[PDB]
Amino acid sequence: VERALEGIVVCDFSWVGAGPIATSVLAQCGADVIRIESVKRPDTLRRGEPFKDGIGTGLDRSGYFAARNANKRDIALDMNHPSAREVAVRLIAKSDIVINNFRVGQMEKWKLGWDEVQKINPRAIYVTMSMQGTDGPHSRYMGYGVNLNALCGLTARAGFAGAPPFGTGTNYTDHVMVPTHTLFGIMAALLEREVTGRGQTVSLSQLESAISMTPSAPMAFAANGEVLGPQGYGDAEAAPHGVYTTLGYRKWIAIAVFDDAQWAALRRVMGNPPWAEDDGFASAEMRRRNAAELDERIEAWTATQYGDWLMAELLKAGVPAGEVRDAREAIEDEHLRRRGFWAYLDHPEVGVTLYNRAPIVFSRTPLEMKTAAPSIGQHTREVLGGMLGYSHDEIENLVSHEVLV
Amino acid sequence: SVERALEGIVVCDFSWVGAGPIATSVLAQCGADVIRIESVKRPDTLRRGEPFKDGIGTGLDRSGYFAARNANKRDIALDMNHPSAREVAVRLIAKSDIVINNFRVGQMEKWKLGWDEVQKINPRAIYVTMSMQGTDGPHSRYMGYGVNLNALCGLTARAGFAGAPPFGTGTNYTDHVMVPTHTLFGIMAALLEREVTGRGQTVSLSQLESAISMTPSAPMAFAANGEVLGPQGYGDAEAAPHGVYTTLGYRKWIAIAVFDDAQWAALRRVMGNPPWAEDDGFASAEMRRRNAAELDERIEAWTATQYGDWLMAELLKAGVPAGEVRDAREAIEDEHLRRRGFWAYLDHPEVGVTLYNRAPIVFSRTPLEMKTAAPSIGQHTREVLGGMLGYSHDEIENLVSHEVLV
Amino acid sequence: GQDFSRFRVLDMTGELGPYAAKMFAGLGADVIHVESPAGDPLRRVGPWFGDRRDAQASLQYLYYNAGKRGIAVDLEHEAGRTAFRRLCDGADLLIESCRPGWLDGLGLSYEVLSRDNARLVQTSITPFGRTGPLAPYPGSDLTCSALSGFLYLAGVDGDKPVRAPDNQAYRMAEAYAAVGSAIALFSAQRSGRGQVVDVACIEAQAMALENAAQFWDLEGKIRRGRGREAGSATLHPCADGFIALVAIMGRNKPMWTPFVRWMEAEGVEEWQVLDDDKWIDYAYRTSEEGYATFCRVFERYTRTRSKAYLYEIGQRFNVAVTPVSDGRDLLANPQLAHRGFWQTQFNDTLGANVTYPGAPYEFGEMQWRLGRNAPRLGEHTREVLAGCGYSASEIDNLVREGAVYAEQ
Amino acid sequence: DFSRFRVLDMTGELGPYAAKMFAGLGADVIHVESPAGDPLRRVGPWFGDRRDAQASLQYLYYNAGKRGIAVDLEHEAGRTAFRRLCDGADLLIESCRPGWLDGLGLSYEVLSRDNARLVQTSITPFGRTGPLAPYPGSDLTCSALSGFLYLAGVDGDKPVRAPDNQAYRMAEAYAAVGSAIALFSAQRSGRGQVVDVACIEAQAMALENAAQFWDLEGKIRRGRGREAGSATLHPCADGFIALVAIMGRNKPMWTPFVRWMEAEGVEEWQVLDDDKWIDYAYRTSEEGYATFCRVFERYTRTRSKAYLYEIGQRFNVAVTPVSDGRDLLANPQLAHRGFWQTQFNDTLGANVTYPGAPYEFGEMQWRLGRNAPRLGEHTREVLAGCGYSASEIDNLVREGAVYAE
Ligand SMILES: *SCCNC(=O)CCNC(=O)[C@H](O)C(C)(C)COP(=O)(O)OP(=O)(O)OC[C@H]1O[C@@H](n2cnc3c(N)ncnc32)[C@H](O)[C@@H]1OP(=O)(O)O
């Protein structure tokens, strides 16, 4: 077993969203991710649904928290304790990456800004994530993923024309846009450190990471002076392109046609009904012009079909199609399971439950899923005595003073 | 017992042509010792620019374009690319309160006289620079003159008749007031600060940003409303009537501006209360705006039968803003500007007595002074070198014999 | 200060793929966009620069392929495949979005491409992956979103879902493919051995189910979108648009009282209805009555006020409020202005300035940059092949047989 | 910084930029209005469709950074309060009609009786003294009488106005300078004085060389715009550009322009490759100017402002766009410099964007300052700051001597 980040150590202050999912990826690559979580301020997700069997007792039953924290170690350091900084310094001295997603200024309250980390460990990569920058009129503002969806322009362009916008239905910004840019910045600094022997700071604006993956709204306005509106489930080029009812409860199929060859294949799957042979649907331009009627006619037909059988037929004919799956269908999907995306891990409290690896299949250094999410302070003594070199007596003293739990 | 507001202030003035010289001219009128550094090999371009005394453009000391920006200054002729010239500038910087230059970026650094160097020569020195639009940025190397800045800052687009090509001011306006006044205020702010801190500091200006700061409506209206605010000729957004109207004589116009119903009643009175003006289509400010086209035509039909100076007098005596549209001769000959002492005539060894003006400030206790016409290149080299900078007669002779100076 | 200039990245991508290589270009890597002679399909989708519809007018193409040079090679031609192999011989990273099996079937498997370049990383970006039951079949942004579970969350109750803008199925895969590439590149620097990096849209989007999978695994519940839990990730209309609100989450109690403070301070009619502990429990917020009078009370007030007002007054009272920004708002955002985010660069092919999103991160030593304007088709074919050791005559003959396409 | 200086600012449509410059460097600036309101509040352009007392964009800009009071100087108790304010002020800037304050018993000698340092700056259309001092002036009529307006045209054409009341702005900028000079002097002498700045004089500072043309050559000049290639304006595809390709006999400036035309393949560019263009008399001749516009505008009419700016400057020619408000907000150089200042306005309930700093200092910091005041917004606290009891203020409010919001 070869691991891409073998030997890497992460001092992980990050919590809630974005930060934790990023360090989860590092841990799947073999990095020793040491999460600092105090009993004084437990990760808010530990108290968030869903819980095993809907029983939200204690702090170790939430799948919201758990899914973001597989394969991590956890030390319960109360960073506001006067004696805590000395423990954190020992860890930073052994860490390749120091990361946090607190509000701006928090690390400096603990005298753990870059200036001090660079002196503790000139090889450390000091990673900070702010909502929208360390400085500026809005730098003290706060928000969750759904807030950044709105501020970055995504939500306005995620909805039906003429209706209230909807967004993604999730805290999307935190799940992919922010952690991926964070991870890339980390890796860039690690690659550079291989040559320079020095760490450096990596600072991300979550707002700017999100806009960087939704460029059309600002670019279209900056270039043409008009706001690019939402388009529901339609497309600007593909035709037909939409979401259509099939048989069953809240059952839809997505169908997307990009050229005349795919339109001919869709017509054949439909049984070549006379209506689809009309000159009003013969070219991509006409199918766009007549999209409303086209969608109505397609839905009249898809509503008589089983969506899985129809999807299989369309894909076999070269037409992009996909059943609109709920989460159970994703969990039970032959494809994701054969790919090994889903992973079940045992947990002393909740038993065997569902996790997933990050979406990368390495041919030589594959991701690994080894341990369920930790409890607060699960590895306090192990880390203090093993990595940080505290004597047995010093650990007992630290615990008596409640520096750690 | 003459009191001068800037008594004892010394200015090391590398600046030339436009904005910089105008600013230091004001300092000189306040009693500052402004020592202009000019090279004979690279004289101020304005010295070769019309107007010239009697239209004779021989030599370098006959231009009114140059002269009017350089009253009351002393002038030493340094070739700053000679190594021995640098040492002279250091001595001057060492005694100067203000160091100013408006070369393109990097020029002072070529001579190792940047702020880093000047602060070590004299921590009390105020180091003044300017650029078209900033020293760094995508357009920082761009070039332009006052007319270019009028256009870039948004002024020219809003200086013209609706539906016609814009005109601007007809001048290099940005350089004449916007830039020099902000330059001067920044200098004075730094001098006020130095009184308490004992240290000089850098003062830097973007000419573009100085200009926009005095033309806020175009950017503010677009930023707030998404509307481009257009030009309005000689009209106004609130006043009505408001415009430029023909009177008797060659290219004769009078400006008239009415801001309320009382001033409109006064204009009607001066016009002799013609029935047309009693219409309710003109009874309110908003109706006079709606009917501005007809109103302007009717006003001009009447003003064109009148002498503008007599009409202006009658309107002002009725409380109506009015003013003949004056050419430069009329401004020079104006009873008011002359009674105010705005214009000043100074004798010059080459062109004789010619017209200058003081800056537009009447100080009740430390009045501006107009004492000497613009200097010739190197007129004061020996006086400054020996008097202020402490060079011996032989060292002076050696500096000038080698062509380092004069 | 340093940069990525030592890394050469071959980027054979189209509508799917190109943001990954842009991330490398943004830190200074030598990135070469590889097109077919028929041209990158991203050139043919909007939005567009003005009324232009030509090969250089796609705003997306300009954005995702800034910072890259451009070549054109026909891999269906044996001499094109020979040149491609010479290119791969000198590359640190190949990113590509080809249909699964195509390169293998052309004799261009990873083992071939790396035979004389053991460190080579090959990253494949595909709808469903290089392997598995769906790998043979076509996918698009919409259909990957459907099959991953992501699309279904963009609605409530029986409503059909809406799409995310800017092909997020593609963008999610590309962002994770950039990460995977960088991880494999780091591993290769240390081990001397590259590998294949397989990133599928369907998997990248399953990363964005939030907690929907855990809701099924742990509670046997099918969830859809947020938007109907009173005061928790809800959207509300105002005078000039919409705002997004997170005034309470989970069973974490600080957050609600400040929201009531705000409503009281503003004199919102019926504010007192909100001063009640019935609002602290996840089951009540999601109840019909809990949600409806939350919106009655709040939206009676928000509907009279602007997005910027609520952003200001909300964050002023410490409530996590943000505006639903449109493109105009984004360009006017004073925080982004303070940060210098918007990048403007004159484009000589268009004869105009183009404004782009800017850096997503900052580094202590490295420098982010937009880089050169996106390439014209085959713009750099000649110089890139010359850089690989091809003579001027060999290039002419490659053009002559149709193995590559150089611009004129 | 300037916080140690107190500035009283009794100005309206004329006057307010001067005190804004002090406010911009941190001075304690108090905008003094009558209970009837600053007339600038009633002038546009406006914030949207609002026409109320806080909606004038000019009022917001020129009086940002100042607090606000309202006093009725027609009242003896209003005059008493004004004198107590002046007792503690370093600078009073005002634009009253000449003679008005003296006639109220508020001459400079009275106002400085117990404050010898006080500087009083008067900003008026024509000055405190002289044959025009009794009479009204406006931006247009001052521009006419100064000689400045006449230059905004050629031949027999009526002139056009400069935007944003440059008669007022020129006086205000020079009055800020005069104020600072007199303030510096007072800091050293212990004695203030009166600073008298007239619009008609400030604008005569802007005649370029028109007065010297008369004095030296007996010539009446009007505007630039008809000397071929020298401060000429030219139509282009989406507006106009301003060009300076030559001045005097400076052939080195012209050659790069000829090369630009050659490189662009401009029809007849060879016409410009001729030393006749070096001759001012030819550039201003009817045929020279007409032929220049013919050749140049064939090219410019086909290209945008942004194109010509870029390419002209690339060839080292002094070309700039005739920028409109949209061009200004989009200018990438101003963006790079962070010039535009956006500040939320609580009375308007919206963000407002303003021009930014006109200069940078090594130690001092420019700032926009607080939002422009509502009428009498700070009357109470400023009067209490002068030693008035709340009971005395009540009586001042009830008798109408002051207005507090
Ligand atoms: S994906 C969207 C998630 N949001 C972001 O990524 C943006 C960056 N961070 C934030 O916006 C804020 O972190 C959020 C999550 C929005 C709100 O968090 P808080 O405002 O409640 O917390 P702060 O970041 O402001 O400060 C941290 C407070 O929590 C205490 N704390 C953290 N860790 C510890 C430990 N190990 N021991 C003791 N205390 C700890 C901190 O002391 C701090 O609490 P205070 O009481 O303010 O000192």
Ligand SMILES: *SCCNC(=O)CCNC(=O)[C@H](O)C(C)(C)COP(=O)(O)OP(=O)(O)OC[C@H]1O[C@@H](n2cnc3c(N)ncnc32)[C@H](O)[C@@H]1OP(=O)(O)O
């Ligand atoms: S108010 C609006 C006017 N616009 C701007 O101020 C913005 C800048 N734009 C311009 O157009 C230039 O400032 C103009 C007005 C064209 C001046 O052009 P120059 O090229 O002549 O001036 P530079 O600063 O760019 O270079 C200075 C050159 O002159 C020589 N020099 C000056 N003084 C001396 C002395 N005392 N001794 C010797 N040489 C001197 C400098 O050496 C230099 O010549 P180079 O050829 O550049 O070496």
